[PDB]
RNA sequence: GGGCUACACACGUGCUACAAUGGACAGAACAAAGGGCAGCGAAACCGCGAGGUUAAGCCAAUCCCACAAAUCUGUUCUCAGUUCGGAUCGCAGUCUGCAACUCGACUGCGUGAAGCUGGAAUCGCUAGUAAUCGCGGAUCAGCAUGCCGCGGUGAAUACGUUCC
């Protein structure tokens, strides 16, 4: 399926494309204008023309494994160079500058 | 810091360009942590003041888009 | 059909003049392909064996053997028997069809595919593909997939040393 | 071959979304494929998208 | 220059949700009260947006902040960890200011977590009140989920003093 990962057949296109790692709502609406599917179809109901345009538009976009590997490269970069922000990446303490005597409970 | 430029202090820029007009030397004891790293700093070992000591850090190709005080935590913890 | 003709016609003179054999019979040939399954969840999930007794019959129509554990293991909570893993052996025409499915059709669908390893040769001339997701070539049908349980493929040449099995499997179509 | 045990085999006309067709023999009579070997970008040498994309940041001085 | 923003933990107060009386998208309306002189800043232009450039008017019942929001009306999803929720985080930006690294608010793209109404226990409210929705102002360059006021819709119940 489209980027090597599924989209659900029984949703609309705008939100079935959200389940691809790298496309949210607004890049999905930027796609389907360029593709011309008019945002009101199931993806169980498309044509091979109409879904192939979606495929190669997304092939032009930085989506599936590129995003994960490059964001891991950024995180490993500022872990390895030193970089207190990567120290927060490592330890499980919040990165953006946030109080830690209380919650900080996404990270530990 | 958007389109005005990057930021550095003028004194640290002066010291680094004196260092760069001939060749590298010993560490630069520098209390400025607020200043970004220009690509012309790379190789210059500089001593950032953490609050109580001067920590030496050697600047690489990656350590550019950040600032100096990213390479000196101020709070010791365990 | 097509991979036998490709292999014979293009590869056997080219590989024979690449390794300078003193006879045509010294040219390595892929003899068999053994597809291991290795499902060991038969203990806690007694039905699960039928998964890939179902699937590996669809992967290649030669039905796999419901293979048994040859020794009781207490650390795996398992007595000798209570069969573990399925097994296909493969030689003939369906096997070159199977490498046609792997090389040309399946291995794109590895969702993080890059150079699959140079370092998967044993030192004798044999290769293994380690698969982690059971849907790679389009027959597997996501509809009929809940457990993603992957697969071990053992591509077995007749090569006596190792790097000529390398130069065989590059020319068959395995990317590295 | 044992009878009544193996499923059938017909001549699979494997397609692709890039239009390249290929022939095997499978359980399915006809197979449509979205990404073949010649469609997948790893097989096509140094690929367009990810290899044109993967230049690491040149210490982004530019501005 | 750092810290008062530490963090394994407990613990008061609050905000946001867990969703169809809902979410998203488009249309229509209705407020009060207060602030503005090196301040409030229209309109136009550009930028997806945060905002930006030139500049009218205003020492103010005139002009601006100031395009109120729940609401109502159509379209859409159909009861799922989702078209719920937004944490966290990467990248790219914007504004303030010598300077936003520790340590600012906001935007844009993307990732999307715990959570499906909460054990023992426990609090507030008797009417324009509680619940809910926005607006304003001090403080202040910038920082508000706090506080101090303002309106919008707007309930349920009080037999009674047996008990705390």
Contacts of A26 (CB under 8 A, 6+ apart): none
Spell out the SS3 assignment of C35-94.
Answer: EECCCCCCCCCCCHHHCCCCHHHHHCCCCCEECCECCCECCCCECCECCCCEEEEECCCH
PDB resolution in Å: 3.1
Strand D30-31 versus strand D10-14 pairing type = parallel
Q: Which helix (H) or strand (E) holds C29?
A: none
Residues in chain A: 108
Measured between CA atoms, how close is D49 to chain C, in angstroms? 14
Strand C65-66 versus strand C86-90 pairing type = antiparallel
d(CA B41, CA B8): 11
User: b or e along C48-81 (b: 16 or more beta carbons within 10 Å of the residue's beta carbon)?
Assistant: bbebbbebbbbbbbbbbebbebeeeeeeeebeee
d(CA A47, CA A45): 7
Q: Is C105 helix (H, G, I), strand (E, B) or coil?
A: helix
d(CA A34, CA A51): 12
The encoded tokens of residue A14 equal: 């705008």
**Beta-carbon separation of B3 and D63 below 8 A:** yes
d(CA C110, CA D43): 13
Q: Which helix (H) or strand (E) holds C9?
A: none
Residue B30 CA to its chain's centroid (Å)? 7
Cα torsion angle, A10, C111, C59, C54, sign: negative
- Name the experimental technique: cryo-EM
Contacts of D59 (CB under 8 A, 6+ apart): B39, B61, B64, B65
| Cα-based distances in Å from A101 to A64, A91, A93 | 37, 15, 11
| Beta strands across the sheet bearing B54-57 | B28-30, B46-49, B54-57
Which DSSP category does C102 fall into?
A: I
d(CA D63, CA D60): 8
Chain breaks in chain A (C to N over 2.5 A) after: none
Q: Is C108 helix (H, G, I), strand (E, B) or coil?
A: helix
Residue C140 contacts residue C4 (beta carbons within 8 Å) = no
Q: At what angle do helices A48-60 and A26-35 cross, to 10 degrees?
A: 130
**Strand E positions within 7 A of protein Cβ atoms:** 1-12, 76-78, 82-83, 87-97, 99-104, 108-113
The encoded tokens of residue C77 equal: 């909570």
Nearest to C150 by CA among C33, C40, C32, C30: C40
Other Cβ atoms less than 10 A from the Cβ of A20: the count is 22
Cα torsion angle, B32, B38, B41, B43, sign: positive
Preferred mutation among C108, C112, C143 to probe A, highest tally of A CBs within 10 A:
C112
D near C: at least 3 beta-carbon pairs less than 8 Å apart: yes
DSSP codes, chain A: -TTSS---TTSBHHHHGGGSTT--SHHHHHHHHHHT-TT-SBSSS--HHHHHHHHHHHHHSS-SSHHHHHHHHHHHHHHHS--HHHHHHHHTS-SSS---SS---S--
Domains in chain C: boundaries: 1-176
Residues in chain C: 176
Residue B58's Cβ-side half-sphere holds a number of Cα atoms within 13 Å equal to: 4
d(CA A72, CA C11): 41
Q: What are phi and psi of B49, to 5 degrees?
A: -85, 110
Q: Which helix (H) or strand (E) holds B14?
A: helix B10-21
B near C: at least 3 beta-carbon pairs less than 8 Å apart: no
User: Measured between beta carbons, which residues in chain B are less than 8 angstroms from residue D59?
Assistant: 39, 61, 64-65
Q: Which helix (H) or strand (E) holds B34?
A: none
Strand partners, C69: C81
d(CA D2, CA B52): 83
Q: Which helix (H) or strand (E) holds D41?
A: none
The encoded tokens of residue B76 equal: 């010791």
User: Measured between beta carbons, which residues in chain A are less than 8 angstroms from residue C109?
Assistant: 4
The encoded tokens of residue C59 equal: 């992967």
Residue lying closest to nucleotide E91, CA to C1' = A71
d(CA A61, CA A23): 9
User: Measured between beta carbons, which residues in chain B are less than 8 angstroms from residue A81?
Assistant: 60, 62-63
């Amino acid at each position: 399926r489209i980027a090597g990962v599924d989209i659900p057949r029984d949703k609309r296109v705008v939100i079935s494309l959200t389940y691809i790692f790298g496309i949210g709502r607004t890049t999905a609406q930027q796609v389907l204008k360029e593709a011309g599917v008019s945002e009101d179809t199931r993806v169980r109901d498309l044509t091979e023309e109409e879904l192939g345009k979606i495929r190669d538009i997304i092939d032009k976009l930085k989506v599936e494994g590129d995003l994960r590997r490059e964001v891991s490269l950024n995180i490993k970069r500022l872990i390895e160079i030193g970089s207190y922000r990567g120290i927060r990446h490592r330890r499980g303490l919040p990165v953006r500058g946030q109080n830690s005597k209380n919650n900080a409970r996404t990270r530990k | 810091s958007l389109k005005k430029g990057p930021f550095v202090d003028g004194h640290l820029m002066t010291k680094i360009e004196k260092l760069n007009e001939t060749d590298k030397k010993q560490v630069v004891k520098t209390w400025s942590r607020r200043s970004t790293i220009f690509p012309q700093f790379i190789g210059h070992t500089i001593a950032v003041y953490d609050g109580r000591k001067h920590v030496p850090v050697f600047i690489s190709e990656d350590m550019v888009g950040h600032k100096l005080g990213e390479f000196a935590p101020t709070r010791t913890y365990k | 059909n097509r991979l036998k003709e490709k292999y014979n016609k293009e590869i056997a003179p080219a590989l024979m003049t690449k390794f300078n054999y003193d006879s045509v019979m010294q040219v390595p040939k892929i003899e068999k392909i053994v597809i291991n399954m290795g499902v060991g969840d038969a203990v806690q999930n007694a039905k699960a064996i039928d998964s890939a007794v179902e699937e590996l019959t669809f992967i290649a129509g030669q039905k796999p053997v419901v293979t048994r554990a040859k020794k009781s293991i207490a650390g795996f909570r398992l007595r000798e028997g209570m069969p573990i893993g399925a097994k296909v052996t493969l030689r003939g025409e369906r096997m070159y069809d199977f490498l046609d499915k792997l090389i040309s059709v399946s291995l794109p669908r590895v969702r993080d595919f890059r150079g699959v390893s140079k370092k998967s040769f044993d030192g004798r001339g044999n290769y293994t593909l380690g698969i982690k997701e059971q849907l790679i070539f389009p027959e597997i049908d996501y509809d009929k997939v809940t457990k993603v349980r992957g697969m071990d493929i053992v591509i077995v040449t007749t090569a006596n040393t190792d790097e000529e099995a390398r130069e065989l499997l590059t020319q068959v179509g395995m990317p590295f | 071959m044992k009878a009544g045990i193996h499923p059938n085999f017909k001549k699979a006309t494997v397609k692709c979304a890039c239009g390249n067709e290929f022939e095997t023999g499978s359980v399915k009579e006809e197979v449509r494929v979205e990404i073949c070997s010649e469609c997948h970008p790893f097989y096509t040498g140094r690929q367009k998208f990810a290899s044109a994309d993967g230049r690491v940041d040149r210490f982004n001085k530019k501005y």
